TrEMBL record, chain C:
Cu(2+) 2 binds at residues 57, 189. GO terms for biological process: iron ion transport. Cu(2+) 3 binds at residues 113, 191, 242. The keyword Calcium does not apply. The chain holds residues 43 to 311 of 325 of the full protein. Cu(2+) 4 binds at residues 186, 243, 248. One of its GO terms (molecular function) is copper ion binding. GO terms for cellular component: plasma membrane. Residues 28-137, 156-261 form the Plastocyanin-like domain. Signal peptide: none annotated. Keywords: Metal-binding, Oxidoreductase. This is Copper oxidase.
Length: 276, 272, 269
């Protein structure tokens, strides 16, 4: 239960894009990864540097309507303006009615709710989205975290057939956050790696009946995550991840999970010719 | 459990849609909420008041082919006709083979299966759908139940941007039944509220590893439900619910969960 | 953990189709059911009898990049060629750090990855798909296993309104393996029967909180499966399974689960 404070900016980027950043001129798509433990409060001093109204809306976490980020609750931000949004989180526990209050932990995301339409359609399209992870006490922490957003037919708003690729070494505990936005359903698939369809992506134990999958149907505003042990049972290699909707894969919704041997090498990776 | 009877009518509405109702002239879209406990048997004395054949088809519950509500099993209803549909339910238990037979309990739905096409495409389009909840012993009961149906691009057949809205007070245990129909996938989203992706929509305890979500992909004939504590950790307010497919929200697949303070007041909001 | 070997062939079929088989000239769509228990290894000696490159890619199981079936990892097969693919599987267990490694068990599937495109788009369209079941120790075995593949708008590449139908007797333990491919989402729906949305399709016991469903949204390359007791609580009947996407049911994405009395008859059928 720490109270934490950050600045965030929305900015226009080149080529008709928009993004969030931790400093002016440093906006990225996806936006910065926000990580909190259950019980933490985060105050985000948000500045809209753009010429259109913009907002910050978050899935999963606790907020009052004054931090809804909506036209409806008059909690977006005028051009050039500043607003502090507050996100709270809670741990799980038993209610006075005997039921179990689910905690805030999970794989969540934030995004704009007012650019283009009062649902943020244009803001989302242009890049105003990012990942938020809320951890539960005791959760295992990864060696690296990678964010994959399927935004209509693009991955992280990159051009078709441009990745992103992510590197690891065999044995690394690698976390993926997978967010979808826009108009289309997708199926997220990874070669060589599987996860549990539950909160953490890992089965809790032999009593966990969660389904174990390597392919998952997602639609706009869905978020999930998981951890894998890179190359577990499969070894090193260039391991594709892709949408499995066939025309989407063919049109470029593919990237590589590049898993190195501990000697540094990737089996089969031969970028250059050799004489003779 | 208990043996029960209701009357149900299919009616063409004054605006030309089609609805089920517990009485003549009182059809609604969605149709009336049916609620059963596992073991209960329900006999539905159904009358088709319309000029085309209509039927009653239920997900999840136990019925014989004579209550399939289909043409294939000769169990639709002629115009002006009557037929008694029987729905049974069972509790969970151990089979003699050692496996666990799942109970009937869940968030289910009924709909027409013969209006327009032999899959009820017309009937469903026009409003012939409704919720059924089968409860397990010990299930927690809510203060209120609200049914949200994404039927093609409409919510409960309401015009674009016309709700429905649902009102509650802070702290109320509110149940939602969420059913999809037609041609389109959607994603159901609620502002300010979350639930577990499991039978009841509530975690059973610290050992339940179910996903806790505020957004869920659904397709035709999917049904789920959940209960929230209205405004828990978030306060009173107009809390939007909407499809999160961007063009669908923009086209009007939005409504409000209006959570009031215990003095009846709400923070000011500015609706469409 | 047994080591098993099989042969597999990819063959062209009529109407521009393509399929896998366990014997030359016996290719089917879907391909043959492959069944393994956790820990088993399978070596598949694969021959591509066709005149274009083709491959074999599997979901869920353990393989090295030399068995990925992809151009990327130079593991497809040239026209008329042969290659041995190796699938391994593993049981669940605890890692040295105390975390739980999920097992390979599940309802999985295999398909082509290089016909038509580098994602096997044409291969899959034409019929190069089939089911693989990996069982865990103690799993209940069924009387029969039926495979239902929604491949674009066709079931098992059959023409509209042409089933397939599957027959059982009241009380039989019947397993379904349900795979989706291509471009479209679907909702898989069965009349008169329900299953748990977990690994086996049956709840593990009274503490399993998995949703119990009769309708499930699926997209390309999804796979799941379940077991039912045929007619349980509902009796004998012609019990439709269908996509519940209304135009898709109307256009023929429908079959029958024909559940017979012990005397062999069915109600008004
Ligand atoms: Cu919203
Ligand atoms: Cu896609
Ligand atoms: Cu959102
Ligand atoms: Cu049907
Ligand atoms: Cu929608
Ligand atoms: Cu239905
Ligand atoms: Cu692939
Ligand atoms: Cu379909
Ligand atoms: Cu695949």
């Amino acid at each position: 239960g720490e109270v934490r404070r950050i600045k965030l900016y929305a900015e226009r980027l080149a080529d008709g894009q928009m993004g969030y950043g931790l400093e002016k001129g440093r906006a990225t798509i996806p936006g910065p990864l926000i990580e909190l433990n259950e019980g933490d409060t985060l105050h985000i001093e948000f500045e809209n540097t753009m010429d259109v109204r913009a907002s910050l809306y978050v899935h999963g976490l606790d907020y009052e309507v004054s931090s809804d980020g909506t036209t409806l609750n008059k909690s977006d931000v005028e051009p050039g303006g500043t607003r502090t949004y507050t996100w709270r989180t809670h741990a799980p526990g038993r209610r006075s009615d005997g039921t179990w209050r689910a905690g805030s932990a999970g794989y969540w995301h934030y995004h704009d709710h007012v650019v283009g339409t009062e649902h943020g359609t244009g803001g989302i399209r242009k890049g105003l989205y990012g990942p938020v992870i809320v951890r539960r006490k005791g959760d295992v922490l990864p060696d690296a975290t990678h964010t994959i957003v399927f935004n209509d037919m693009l991955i992280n708003n990159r051009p078709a057939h441009s990745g992103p690729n992510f590197e690891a070494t065999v044995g690394d505990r690698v976390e993926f956050v997978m967010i979808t936005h826009g108009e289309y359903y997708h199926t997220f698939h990874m070669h060589g790696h599987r996860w549990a369809d539950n909160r953490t992506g890992m089965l809790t134990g032999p009593d966990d009946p969660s389904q174990v999958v390597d392919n998952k149907i997602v639609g706009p505003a869905d978020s999930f995550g998981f951890q894998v042990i890179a190359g577990e049972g499969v070894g090193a290699g260039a391991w594709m991840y892709h949408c499995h909707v066939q025309s989407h894969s063919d049109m470029g919704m593919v990237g590589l999970f590049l898993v190195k041997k501990t000697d540094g090498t990737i089996p089969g990776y031969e970028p250059h010719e050799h004489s003779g």
